[PDB]
Amino acid sequence: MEVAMVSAESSGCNSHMPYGYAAQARARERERLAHSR
């Protein structure tokens, strides 16, 4: 089971980052822990 961590810092212009960028940091960071290749 994972810890209950809720967060939503975005209600105007906080997620101004281009779509896909918020999914490249964790996608590349997950390789350091799930390094299977």
Side-chain angles (χ1 to χ4, degrees), residues 15-34:
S15 201
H16 40 223
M17 280 136 217
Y19 192 88
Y21 195 85
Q24 120 82 46
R26 201 76 217 228
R28 251 65 136 98
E29 193 195 271
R30 71 107 223 267
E31 209 76 89
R32 185 228 144 150
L33 318 165

